[PDB]
Amino acid sequence: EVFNATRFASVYAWNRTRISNCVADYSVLYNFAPFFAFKCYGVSPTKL
Amino acid sequence: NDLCFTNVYADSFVIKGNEVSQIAPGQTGNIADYNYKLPDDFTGCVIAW
Ligand SMILES: *[C@@H]1O[C@H](CO)[C@@H](O[C@@H]2O[C@H](CO)[C@@H](O)[C@H](O)[C@@H]2O)[C@H](O)[C@H]1NC(C)=O
Ligand SMILES: *[C@@H]1O[C@H](CO)[C@@H](O)[C@H](O)[C@H]1NC(C)=O
C-alpha cells in the first residue's frame, strides 16, 4: 500500500507513512518495481 | 596488455539492459542472486555491447 498507490504526492509535499508493528519481507518491494536505483546507505539490501 | 595472468575465464551470456548494471560484485536482483553471482573479490572485466 506504499507501492500500489496512484498519487504519490509531489516533492513539495512529500507524503510520509509510518511502518510499525509488522514483519518486513522486502521481496514484495522487489517484485513491485523494476528497480532503477537501490542506493541504501545505513544497511546493505542483501541482508535486510 | 602489460599483465601476465595464470588462467582467464570468459563467461558469456546475453541479457537485458538493466541487468548489465546488475552484474557486479556484491550485487543483487532476480539475476544476480539466482542466475549469475560474481564473486565479491572479482578481479576482472565485464563487457556489454
Ligand atoms: C500517503 O499515502 C498512503 C498510501 O497508503 C496513505 O495511506 C492511506 O490513507 C488513506 C486516507 O487518505 C487511508 O484511508 C488508508 O487506510 C491508508 O492509510 C496516506 O494517507 C498518505 N498520506 C498523506 C499525508 O497523503
Ligand atoms: C497495483 O498494482 C497492480 C500491478 O502493478 C496494478 O494492476 C493495479 O492497478 C495497482 N493498483 C492501484 C490502486 O494502483
Side-chain angles (χ1 to χ4, degrees):
Chain A
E1 291 71 20
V2 200
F3 285 71
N4 216 174
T6 77
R7 186 30 51 96
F8 303 74
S10 292
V11 67
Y12 84 96
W14 42 284
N15 176 7
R16 159 164 265 170
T17 69
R18 184 202 38 63
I19 299 315
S20 318
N21 332 296
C22 69
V23 179
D25 38 3
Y26 303 100
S27 272
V28 50
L29 171 150
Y30 256 55
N31 71 18
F32 271 82
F35 258 25
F36 152 79
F38 202 9
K39 312 326 304 312
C40 301
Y41 304 73
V43 152
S44 182
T46 325
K47 51 171 41 54
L48 177 34
Chain B
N1 304 295
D2 321 320
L3 328 169
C4 279
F5 324 87
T6 81
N7 290 60
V8 202
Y9 304 70
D11 312 341
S12 39
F13 56 84
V14 295
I15 190 146
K16 217 158 291 190
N18 38 4
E19 281 88 350
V20 168
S21 165
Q22 190 157 147
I23 66 153
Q27 282 289 296
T28 182
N30 90 82
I31 297 287
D33 284 293
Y34 323 111
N35 295 248
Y36 188 93
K37 195 159 300 172
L38 311 87
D40 40 10
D41 66 292
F42 179 44
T43 81
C45 297
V46 316
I47 277 168
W49 68 113

